[PDB]
C-alpha cells in the first residue's frame, strides 16, 4: 500500500475529529491514564463501536478484571457485552491470574500469549484488539529494559497479524512520566494520554493525542466526560467558524427596546445584558423567554442564581405566567448551582437539554455565575462552546452578565466576552437627586442601526418601561450625573 | 584542514539559519527530545533532502520502527523512500530486534553495526547517515558509564568514516535532563533538542541548538511546526530589520480618512485601528478589503470573531458586495476560532494563505482576539511575526484591536504593540447628551502629516461618514466629555 | 596590591578584575558547567593568552575531545595551536580512550596519568595546565568518596609540582550541585561556575566565582558572551563611578530646545526623551543625529522599532537626508529587534559598534523596546551599562522611552531610569478644542537652568517647531486641561 495513513473509526464521540479519522489501522495505540481516568472505558467503546457500526468483531484482552465484571461494568453505559460473545463478535481472552500460583513465569506466557491472543483473532475474525493493563503484567518483578522488549515483542506480533489495537497504561502522576516505565512511550506508534486533573478540588477530565506516527491530528488536551453513553469529548478548538446568519428580526419581549434594536434582536444572534445587580438582567431575561412562547415557540431557561419557585414568584408579580409556559410545554426552566459541576458537564448538560427540547431561543442567567472559582481562560472556552453550539443551531440567545461593580464600571465585561457577542445590551444605575435610577442602553448590534440613546427606564407589576434619555445631563455613564 | 569547521545544509526550512549553515560535517549531532517530538522526521528529512538537493546518498539506521513502516509513514509528506530505495540513493540499514528477541548484545552489535554501516556508507557512497533511537540499543540493562563508552565509540567510529550523522535520542521531561541517561549530551559534539512543551492544555514544539563545537548558532528556542511539508521552523529573532519603504499611498475605503491621513495609508506599512466593541473597527476591515478589490487588488482579510457568513451579513448591510468580491478572486476571506491553534500555527496558516493568494492588503480582525489566554510575550513574537512578514512583502496591513475598556481607556493597547504599527486609527465612544456618539482619530502616522483633529462620525446603510470635532468640548479622550 | 595571593592573569576579558587579579598561581581552579557553557573554550583560552601574552608554555590534558578536534575548533576564535604545538609552546596531552578499549583503569592511571603530565610539564618547562572533562575519567563506575581521594590526590600532585591549574567538571542543573559527585566543589582551591540559563525561551550565560581560597572577588553572576573572540565578560557592578564631566553644550539639532536647555545639551550627559507613540522622540533622534554630522562629527543610531528603510523614508520627509551622512561616513545607523538577541548581546553589540567607529554621539532609539519581555532588574542592569560606557567615553547620548499610556502618565519611566538620566525631555499630547496638539518640555538638567515652560511645538516637513505655553490652561499634565 503505497498511500497515506489509513485510519479505523473509533465513533467515540469528538475522537476521531481530534485524531483526524480514527486510530491508524493495523497498529497499536498507547492509552495511559491515572487510575480511574477511564482507560478500560475507552478500550471496550473501541470494541464496541466496532460490532455494532461496522460488525467488525473484538477481542479484549484482561489481565486484571474479571470477564464477569467488564460485562457486570458495561451494563453501566447500557453495553451488553454478553450479548456480543454469545453472537460471537466479541470475545473475552481472560488473562488474569488466579487467587494461587508459582513464579519465574516471565516472558514464558509473554509469548504463549501472543499466540493465545492470535488464536482468538483468527478464530473470531477479529479486526480491533484491546489489551486492558499491558502494564500489570511485568508488574511482577522488571526493570525498564525487560518491559521494552516485551512491549516490543507483543507491538510487533500483533502488527504482523494486522490487527488494530489499543493497549491500556497506568501512571501515577497527572503530569509526570507517560507510563509506568517511561518506555511504552518510544514503543508505541501512537499515544493517548487521559487525564484527570484535580485543581481547586474540583476534577477535568482531558484527553491527548501526544503523536500518531505517519499523519496528523489534534494537538493538546481536550476536555471530556464519562456518562451513560460513555466518553464524550468536546474539540472546542475544532468548531468551525461557518455559522449560519440571517436578516430575520425577533423580539425582545419588550417593544421599546425592539425600537432601540432597529426592529428587534436578529434570530441568528447572541445578546449580552450586562449590568450591576439589581439593574433588571433577569426581568429581560423572562420577557425574553416569555416572548417566545407567546408565538409558541420553544425556549430553555438556564438558572444560575435563582431557584426554580423563585423565578416563579418574581416572574409572577412581573406580570408573565411562568406556570403556563411549562404546561404548554414551550418553556423549560433548568437551574443548577455553578458549583455542582465543572464547566464541561455544564456544556454538556445544555448542549443534551437542547437536543431533547428543540428551542427556539435560550437564555442564560448569568454567565458570570459560571465564572466563579474557574479561570478565565477556561471560562472563554466554555462561552465560545454555548455561544457557537447555538449559532450554528439557528438558535437566539441571550446571555447575562453581572459587572462586579455598580456604577463606574469602565468595562463591559471583566471576564471579557463582549467580543464574543452580537448584540450589547447595558443596564446601569444612575444616580439623580438622591435617588437610584436605571438606565437601558443598547450598546451595539452588529447588523442594525439601534438607538444610541441612554434611557431611563423603571420596573412595575406590568415590567420595563423605556422613557426618555437625560439630555440635559453630564457623565452619566459615571453614575453620577452633573445636570446641566 | 586550516580554516574553521565546514557545515552541510539539511534544507530543512529555517534549521540552517538557526545553525548558522546547517550540520557541522564529519560529525554527529544529537537530537532528542520527549515522544512525538519529531526527531525521526529531522532524521528522515535530512536525508531526504539531501539526496534530492545535492544527491548525495544517506544510510538510515533504525532499530526500532520497521523498514517498511519509516517508508509508509514518509508517505504522509509526499516522501517515496521506496523509490530512493531502489535507485540505490537511500539504505535502511534494518537494525531493530526480532520477535524472538536473545540476551547480551552489547559488544558484537557496536563493531558489527559499524561494519555494516560503515559497509552500506561505502557501498552506497553514503554523505549522510541518522541513527534513530540509539537510546532504545542499550536500553538492554546499561549503567551511565557504559552508556558513555559505547556513545563515544560510536561517535569515534562514524568521526572515522567521515560520515556526517544525526543520532536520535529519547527524554522523559520537556526540561529535565537532556537525554536519558544524562551522559550523551557531553560525549555529542553537537546537541539539538526538539521540545513539545503543555502549558495550558495547548502543545508549543520548540528547537534549539544548545551547542556546536567549533562555530556559532542562534541560541534559545525556536517554534517550529510540523505539517505536510515537514518540520517548519520560524527563527523569529533571525528576521533582519531591513524592510522597504516608499512614499506610495493607498486608499483607506472611506475618503475622509485618507484626507486625515494626508492622502491616505502609505503601500509600506501597518495600521492599526482601535477602539471599544462596537466603535467599527470590523467596518474599517471591510472598507478596507473592497478599496483593493474596486482597484482589482488581491487581499486577505483574517477573521477570528465573526463567521463566513456573519461578514457577509454585515458586509452588505454596509453596502459594498463581499460575495463578488470572492466570484473575481480579488478578494479571500479566512475565518476561524483563536483557540483552534497556537500562535505558531497561525502564523504560518497566514503565511501560506499569502503566499497562495498574492496579496496587494491584509486585514487582520482583531489581534486582541488572538492574544486570548496566550502570554504576552508570545503574543508579541507572533505580532512581530505577522507584521514584518507583511513588511518585507510590500504588502499593506491593516490590524484590529479591541481595548477591554470602553472609554477612559489610558493605553492605546492593553497588549502594547502600538510600538511596532506605522499608523494608527483610534475610534472611541463619546457620551454626549445622554447619547453614545462616536469618534475617529488619526493617533499617528510615521511619514505623513495627518489631521489632528478627533471628528466625530456616525454609521449608515452607506458606511461610515466622518462629520466635525467636538471644539466645544473638554475632556473628550475620556468618553464623557464636558459642553462649555 | 593588598591581596595575599599570588595570581595570574588570564587575559580574558573581564575575568581578572571578577578574580581580583586572575588565578591565584600554584593552585587549581575548578571550572563546572552544564552542556555548551564554555568550559573548554574557557580552559583552552587560560592557556593561549598564556602563551601569546607571557610565552608561558601550557600542557592541555583532554579526556573526551580529539587533539585534532581540539585544534580544529579553536580555528573558530582564529588561534592556531597547530602552531603553537610546533613551536613547542604548547603540548596536548591526549588521554581519551580508544574506540576499541575494554574496563577497569581510573585509577593506576589516576597515577600513570599524575607522572604523564609531570614529564610534559617539565619537558615543556609548562607553567599552566587545563585538564578538560576530568568528570569523565571516573565516569566508568566510581561512588562519591573514590572520586573525592582521586581529585584530591591529583590536586596535590599538581600543586607539588607548582603548576597553576584549571579543571573542568560537568552539571546536569543549573542550579543544582556543583558539580556531578558533589564532591569536587570542596577539593579544589578556587571553584568558577559556567552557567547558561534558559529562563523565558532566551539562553543567558554568566560566570560565578563562587570560591578563592585566600583572596577576595567579586560575588555573584556575571553575564558573558562568547564571540569569535572567546569569552567576554562584564562585570558591570565593577564598573567604577569616575565618569569625567564638562561644562561643554552641543546642540540637540533644534535651536529652540537648545534655548530651553540654557544653551544646548552637555557634552558629557545622558539624555532621555520620553512620550507616548506619535509625540516625535523619534524626530528628536534624526534631528540629534543630523547635527552631529552637520560639524562633521561621528555618530551612531541604534534603531530598535524603525526597518533601516523606514527611518530614511521617514528622515527625508523631515528635511534632513540620512543617505549623504552615511556615505559622507558621518552617521552609521545598525537596526536589530529587541527579540534577536538577549540583553547581555545587545550591550556587546553597541559597545563593539562604538569602538569601530569612534563616535561622538549615540542616539538609542526606544530602551522601552528593549524592555520587552525582560525582567526589570536585568533591564536596569543594560541601561547603567551602556549609560556608563557612552558616559566615560565622552559620548553624548539621547536615549528615547515610550510610555505605555498617552496622556495622564503619572511616572516620568514606567522602568524607573529618570534616575540615571542627566537631561530629561517630556513630550505629551494635550487635548486642546477637540484636537490633539504636542506639548515639548525640558522636565530636569543636572547643570544648567533649562526653560520650565510646556511649550506645544508642531511638525512639519521642516520638522519641529517650538511655540509658546499654555498660559491660560489648568491640568495641561492631565492631557485633557480646562481652559480658564
Ligand atoms: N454511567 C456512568 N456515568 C458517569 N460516570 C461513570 C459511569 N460508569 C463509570 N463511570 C466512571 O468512569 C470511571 C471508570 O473508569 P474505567 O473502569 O473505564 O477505567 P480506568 O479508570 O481508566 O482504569 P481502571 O481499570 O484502573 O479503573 C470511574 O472512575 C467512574 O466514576
Ligand atoms: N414587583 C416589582 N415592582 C417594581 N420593581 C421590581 C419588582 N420586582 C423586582 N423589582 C426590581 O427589579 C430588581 C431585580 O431585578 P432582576 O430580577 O431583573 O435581575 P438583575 O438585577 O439582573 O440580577 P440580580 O439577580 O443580581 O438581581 C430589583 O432591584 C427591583 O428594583
Ligand atoms: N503530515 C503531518 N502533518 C502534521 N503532523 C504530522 C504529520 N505527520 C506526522 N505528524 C506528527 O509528527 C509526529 C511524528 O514524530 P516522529 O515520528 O517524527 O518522531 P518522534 O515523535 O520524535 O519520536 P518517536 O520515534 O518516538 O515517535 C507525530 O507526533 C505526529 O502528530
Ligand atoms: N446598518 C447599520 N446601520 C447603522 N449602524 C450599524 C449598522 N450595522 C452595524 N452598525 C453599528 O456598527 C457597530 C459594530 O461595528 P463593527 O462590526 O465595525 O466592529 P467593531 O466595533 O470594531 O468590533 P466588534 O466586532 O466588537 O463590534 C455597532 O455598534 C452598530 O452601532
Ligand atoms: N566563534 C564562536 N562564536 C560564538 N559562539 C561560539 C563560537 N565557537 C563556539 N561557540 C559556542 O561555544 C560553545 C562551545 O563550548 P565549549 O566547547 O567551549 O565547552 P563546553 O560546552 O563547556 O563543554 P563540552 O566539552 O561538553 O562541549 C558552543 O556552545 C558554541 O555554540
Ligand atoms: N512630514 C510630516 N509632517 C507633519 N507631521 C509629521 C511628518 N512626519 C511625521 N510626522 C508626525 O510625527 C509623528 C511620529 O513621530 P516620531 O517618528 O517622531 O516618533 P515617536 O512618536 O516618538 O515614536 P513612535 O516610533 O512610536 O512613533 C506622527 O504621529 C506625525 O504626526
Ligand atoms: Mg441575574
Ligand atoms: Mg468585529
Ligand atoms: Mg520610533
Not at 32 to 48: P, R, V
Not at 224 to 245: E, K, V
Not at 271 to 281: E, F, P, R, S
Not at 300 to 329: C, H, K, T, V
Amino acid at each position: 500500500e503505497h498511500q497515506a495513513i489509513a485510519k479505523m473509526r473509533t465513533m467515540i464521540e469528538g475522537f476521531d475529529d481530534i485524531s483526524h479519522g480514527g486510530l491508524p489501522i493495523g497498529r497499536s495505540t498507547l492509552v495511559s491514564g491515572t487510575s480511574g481516568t477511564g482507560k478500560t472505558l475507552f478500550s471496550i467503546q473501541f470494541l464496541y463501536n466496532g460490532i455494532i457500526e461496522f460488525d467488525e468483531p473484538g477481542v479484549f484482552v484482561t489481565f486484571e478484571e474479571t470477564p464477569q465484571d467488564i460485562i457486570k461494568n458495561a451494563r453501566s453505559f447500557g453495553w451488553d457485552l454478553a450479548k456480543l460473545v454469545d453472537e460471537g463478535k466479541l470475545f473475552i481472552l481472560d488473562a488474569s491470574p488466579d487467587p494461587e500460583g508459582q513464579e519465574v513465569v516471565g516472558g514464558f506466557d509473554l509469548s504463549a500469549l501472543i499466540e493465545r491472543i492470535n488464536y482468538a483473532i483468527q478464530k473470531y475474525r477479529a479486526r480491533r484488539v484491546s489489551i486492558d493493563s499491558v502494564t500489570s503484567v511485568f508488574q511482577q518483578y522488571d526493570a525498564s529494559s525487560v518491559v521494552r522488549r516485551e512491549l516490543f515483542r507483543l507491538v510487533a506480533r500483533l502488527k504482523q497479524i494486522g490487527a488494530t489495537t489499543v493497549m491500556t497504561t497506568e501512571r501515577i502522576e497527572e503530569y509526570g512520566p507517560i507510563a509506568r516505565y517511561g518506555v511504552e512511550e518510544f514503543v508505541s506508534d501512537n499515544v493517548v494520554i487521559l487525564r484527570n486533573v484535580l485543581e481547586g478540588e474540583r476534577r477535568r477530565r482531558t484527553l491527548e493525542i501526544l503523536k500518531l506516527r505517519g499523519t496528523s491530528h489534534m494537538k493538546g488536551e481536550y476536555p471530556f466526560t464519562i456518562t451513560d453513553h460513555g466518553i464524550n469529548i468536546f474539540p472546542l478548538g475544532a468548531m468551525r467558524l461557518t455559522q449560519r446568519s440571517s436578516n430575520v428580526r425577533v423580539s425582545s419581549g419588550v417593544v421599546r427596546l425592539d425600537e432601540m434594536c432597529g426592529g428587534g434582536f436578529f434570530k441568528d444572534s447572541i445578546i449580552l445584558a450586562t449590568g450591576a445587580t439589581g439593574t433588571g438582567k433577569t426581568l429581560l431575561v423572562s420577557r425574553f423567554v416569555e416572548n417566545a412562547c407567546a408565538n409558541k415557540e420553544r425556549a430553555i431557561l438556564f438558572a444560575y442564581e435563582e431557584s426554580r419557585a423563585q423565578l416563579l414568584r418574581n416572574a409572577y408579580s412581573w406580570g408573565m405566567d411562568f406556570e403556563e409556559m411549562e404546561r404548554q410545554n414551550l418553556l423549560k426552566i433548568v437551574c443548577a448551582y455553578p458549583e455542582s459541576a465543572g464547566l464541561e458537564d455544564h456544556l454538556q448538560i445544555i448542549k443534551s437539554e437542547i437536543n431533547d427540547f428543540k428551542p427556539a431561543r435560550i437564555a442564560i442567567d448569568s454567565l458570570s455565575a459560571l465564572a466563579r472559582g474557574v479561570s478565565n481562560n477556561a471560562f472563554r472556552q466554555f462561552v465560545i462552546g454555548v455561544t457557537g453550539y447555538a449559532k450554528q443551531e439557528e438558535i437566539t440567545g441571550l446571555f447575562t452578565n453581572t459587572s462586579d461593580q455598580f456604577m463606574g464600571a469602565h468595562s463591559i465585561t471583566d471576564s471579557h466576552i463582549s467580543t464574543i457577542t452580537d448584540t450589547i445590551i447595558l443596564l446601569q444605575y444612575v444616580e439623580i437627586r438622591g435617588e437610584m435610577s436605571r438606565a437601558i442602553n443598547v450598546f451595539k448590534m452588529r447588523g442594525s442601526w439601534h438607538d444610541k440613546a441612554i434611557r431611563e427606564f423603571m420596573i412595575s407589576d406590568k415590567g420595563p418601561d423605556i422613557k426618555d434619555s437625560f439630555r440635559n445631563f453630564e457623565r452619566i455613564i459615571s453614575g453620577s450625573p452633573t445636570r446641566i
